[PDB]
Amino acid sequence: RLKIVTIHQEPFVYVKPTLSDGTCKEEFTVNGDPVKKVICTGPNDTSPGSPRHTVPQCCYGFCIDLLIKLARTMNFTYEVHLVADGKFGTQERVNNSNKKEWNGMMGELLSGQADMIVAPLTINNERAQYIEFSKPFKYQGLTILVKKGTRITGINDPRLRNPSDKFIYATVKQSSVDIYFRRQVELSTMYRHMEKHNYESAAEAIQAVRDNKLHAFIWDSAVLEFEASQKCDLVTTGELFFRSGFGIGMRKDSPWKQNVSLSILKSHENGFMEDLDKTWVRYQECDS
Ligand SMILES: N[C@H](CNC(=O)C1=[SH]CC=C1)C(=O)O
Numbered sequence: 377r378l379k380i381v382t383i384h385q386e387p388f389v390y391v392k393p394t395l396s397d398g399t400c401k402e403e404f405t406v407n408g409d410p411v412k413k414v415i416c417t418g419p420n421d422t423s424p425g426s427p428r429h430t431v432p433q434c435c436y437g438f439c440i441d442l443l444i445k446l447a448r449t450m451n452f453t454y455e456v457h458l459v460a461d462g463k464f465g466t467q468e469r470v471n472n473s474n475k476k477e478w479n480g481m482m483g484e485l486l487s488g489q490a491d492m493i494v495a496p497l498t499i500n501n502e503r504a505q506y507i508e509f510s511k512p513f514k515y516q517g518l519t520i521l522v523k524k525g526t527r528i529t530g531i532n533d534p535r536l537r538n539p540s541d542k543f544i545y546a547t548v549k550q551s552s553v554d555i556y557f558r559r560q561v562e563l564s565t566m567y568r569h570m571e572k573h574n575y576e577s578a579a580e581a582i583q584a585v586r587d588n589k590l591h592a593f594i595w596d597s598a599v600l601e602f603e604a605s606q607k608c609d610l611v612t613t614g615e616l617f618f619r620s621g622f623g624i625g626m627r628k629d630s631p632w633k634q635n636v637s638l639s640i641l642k643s644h645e646n647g648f649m650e651d652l653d654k655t656w657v658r659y660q661e662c663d664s
Pocket residue numbers: 464465496497498499517518550551552553554556595596618619620
């Protein structure tokens with residue numbers, strides 16, 4: 377039985393409590409089909425001061441449908457959990473030493489706490505030095521989420537390039553976004569500004585934009601375009617930049633990689649990815 381690690385990230389992975397009987401609420405898509413739900417164990421409270429408890433929860437969304445299809449096609453059983461520290465994964469010095477380790481889903485894959493990462497996980501060369509990716513199951517990039525009305529053109533807008541205190545922008549801590557900004561000498565002062573204000577999760581950042589506590593949120597277009605399309609008060613702005621895919625993550629020289637990539641190819645070829653899009657990404661008007 378493979379250990380799948382994932383992360384909360386709508387519309388790819390919804391996370392809800394079980395009902396009182398430990399089951400998952402019966403729900404249907406806009407088209408009347410049952411929403412497929414898997415049990416995922418993970419933390420159910422990330423509020424500072426409250427005790428962390430790992431409990432069974434209900435998971436569903438684009439990546440969960442994708443998982444179910446992979447499991448069927450490649451004849452494997454699995455169990456899903458949510459990444460313990462809440463993070464995608466960056467490489468950090470451990471224990472105040474010069475030794476480095478990966479946190480987030482990257483760390484769990486490398487340590488053996490997971491066998492496969494099934495998540496909106498960005499494919500980049502930094503990560504590919506340590507793990508293997510499938511071919512992209514989705515092609516996307518970064519964009520910028522703002523409140524409707526906000527006068528920002530893109531990543532090259534002077535308000536971003538020349539930051540003051542009167543316009544706060546941020547991304548999510550311990551994602552690959554800070555790495556990409558740090559990997560160009562041009563974008564240095566943006567990275568330095570963001571590090572001061574970054575959020576523990578996308579959901580918190582998004583909420584902060586809604587609540588006028590964050591002016592601009594730099595994040596995956598596949599998530600932000602959904603969020604902005606779901607919430608009439610929120611918009612995206614600017615051209616996509618740092619175009620890149622989402623992939624399945626596996627350890628180096630994994631015997632799963634080739635067949636995972638083959639499954640994803642088939643899904644691109646036969647309309648399955650577009651069906652997922654029509655189920656999870658584009659299906660109705662904004663209703664927050
Ligand atoms: N998908 C998340 C967040 N997105 C990213 O880091 C990036 S960097 C360049 C393009 C997308 C992740 O895997 O950490």
